[PDB]
Write a protein that binds this ligand. Structure first.
Ligand SMILES: Nc1ncnc2c1ncn2[C@@H]1O[C@H](COP(=O)(O)OP(=O)(O)O)[C@@H](O)[C@H]1O
Ligand SMILES: Nc1ncnc2c1ncn2[C@@H]1O[C@H](COP(=O)(O)OP(=O)(O)O)[C@@H](O)[C@H]1O
Ligand SMILES: Nc1c(C(=O)O)ncn1[C@@H]1O[C@H](COP(=O)(O)O)[C@@H](O)[C@H]1O
Ligand SMILES: Nc1c(C(=O)O)ncn1[C@@H]1O[C@H](COP(=O)(O)O)[C@@H](O)[C@H]1O
Ligand SMILES: [Mg+2]
Ligand SMILES: [Mg+2]
Ligand SMILES: [Mg+2]
Ligand SMILES: [Mg+2]
Ligand SMILES: [Mg+2]
Ligand SMILES: [Mg+2]
Lengths: 237, 237
């Protein structure tokens, strides 16, 4: 398997086609974004860390019964994945108050959410991923009621599986974002799951070990990403 | 039934208690708000026009089977209503793109929405009525899943009724907001329906005849309100 041509690139990854019409190659670059693309910086080892982090997590979700895009890793920064007809809606689950929920509602950061909250956001950098809801998906044809219901079911299952996984690693899964796509008509988990798209707090100290370190100028971004990778059991070198 | 004392005064109306623990007096003032209370201005006849406009609309909705708060008109600006345990969530139906939808999604104004959209906003002027969804209602306990579903059901029914009503009046019901409350356990329509909380365009010229005239300083605010009153056949004098 080899990259055929660059299809398109986002804020952090490059998507390539392959000789196989149903397979794509995803490249995790060192580009790290904030403000939905307004601020982007490069961190060495970032793409590699996230590529291996994503493989590990998706592997765990797949074992739990969650259908994923993953085929295999091709290098430190690339992975072969099924070509998915992506639903341009980001699925977010919040176990504790943080980020936009805090700014938006004025809720105290760290408050535990029971049951957890579920947010739907439209993928539109220009508009800073505006919040939408189920009626929006039907009215604008982003995804059917049945597929959306599947997306929510799978997102919540992922939450259950990962909360345990991170707790086992002395980490608190605060919130996270998932993106799904259709493969031959079925809902499949695509994109990625990494510290770029989730908030992870050390269980005993509450120290942030995710992209917030970049969003909020705390420094030590990659060091934190790698610390979490190591706690999970991932060998970086 | 008469006013006893002021319980509280909102951006546009004043609520009074009565000898009856289950009845309140709503007083529509001439106060007209924009920016969620940031900019307020007074217009003569405004309170009276909306008070009577509201009674008329509530009546039409009642005759359609929608349970409402309304008891009776008391004066040009006052009406008697059932005391409701208000749900702090604004319910919005959008038939055509306008206002915050256009602002949030960068979508074009006037675009027809099929089916119509349904937005839920937390009632909090301080935070500018932030958009929420059903999960927030469950987690923060603003309203039971059952009652919420009834709120949406009634709102959509109100839309079916009023679209017909306004269309016959040569007008386009672009969007609108409703507030519900609990009365002895049952979900009841409260607050008001007027040009203050709805968008109404002339079917032929698409001229805005609602509070956007105030929001956008287009002049002729009440003239437009009364024009709508006349097309509906609302007695004002
Ligand atoms: N398996 C897949 N098939 C097709 N597109 C995918 C797949 N997984 C992810 N994508 C898309 O590829 C892009 C990944 O690049 P990224 O830099 O994350 O983009 P963005 O700027 O939207 O965050 C996204 O648009 C994502 O939806
Ligand atoms: N039937 C009712 N019973 C109790 N409260 C009501 C009823 N109808 C409306 N209210 C509440 O009374 C207030 C009406 O006044 P208004 O000036 O519109 O207020 P606000 O500035 O809060 O929007 C609102 O807070 C509304 O929720
Ligand atoms: N990574 C992204 C993006 C994005 O990249 O557009 N949107 C949300 N998220 C992730 O979802 C959670 C909630 O994000 P917000 O608090 O900003 O809504 C966080 O873990 C975040 O990293
Ligand atoms: N009047 C209000 C309020 C309010 O007063 O807070 N919130 C929504 N609305 C009405 O709902 C529709 C959508 O409003 P937005 O476009 O602001 O979301 C409009 O008809 C508006 O007047
Ligand atoms: Mg992305
Ligand atoms: Mg995004
Ligand atoms: Mg986003
Ligand atoms: Mg009001
Ligand atoms: Mg409001
Ligand atoms: Mg509002």
């Amino acid at each position: 398997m080899q990259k055929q041509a660059e299809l398109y690139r986002g804020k952090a990854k490059t998507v390539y086609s392959t000789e196989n019409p149903d397979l794509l190659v995803l490249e995790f670059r060192n580009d790290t974004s904030a403000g939905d693309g307004a601020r982007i910086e490069q961190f060495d080892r970032k793409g590699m860390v996230n590529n291996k982090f994503n493989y590990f997590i998706m592997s765990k979700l797949a074992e739990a019964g969650i259908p994923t895009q993953m085929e295999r890793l091709l290098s430190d920064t690339e992975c072969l994945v099924k070509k998915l007809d992506m639903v341009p809606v980001e699925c977010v689950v919040r176990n504790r108050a943080a980020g936009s929920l805090v700014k938006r509602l004025g809720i105290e950061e760290g408050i535990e959410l029971n049951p957890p909250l579920f947010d739907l956001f439209l993928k539109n950098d220009a508009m800073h991923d505006p919040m939408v809801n189920e009626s929006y998906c039907e009215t604008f044809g982003w995804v059917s009621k049945e597929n959306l219901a599947r997306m929510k079911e799978l997102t919540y299952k992922a939450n259950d599986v990962l909360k345990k996984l991170f707790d086992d690693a002395g980490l608190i899964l605060v919130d996270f974002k998932l993106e799904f796509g259709l493969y031959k008509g079925e809902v499949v988990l695509g994109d990625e799951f990494s510290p770029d798209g989730s908030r992870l707090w050390d269980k005993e100290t509450l120290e942030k070990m995710d992209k917030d370190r970049f969003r909020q100028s705390l420094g030590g971004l990659i060091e934190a990403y790698e610390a979490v990778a190591r706690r999970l059991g991932v060998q970086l070198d």
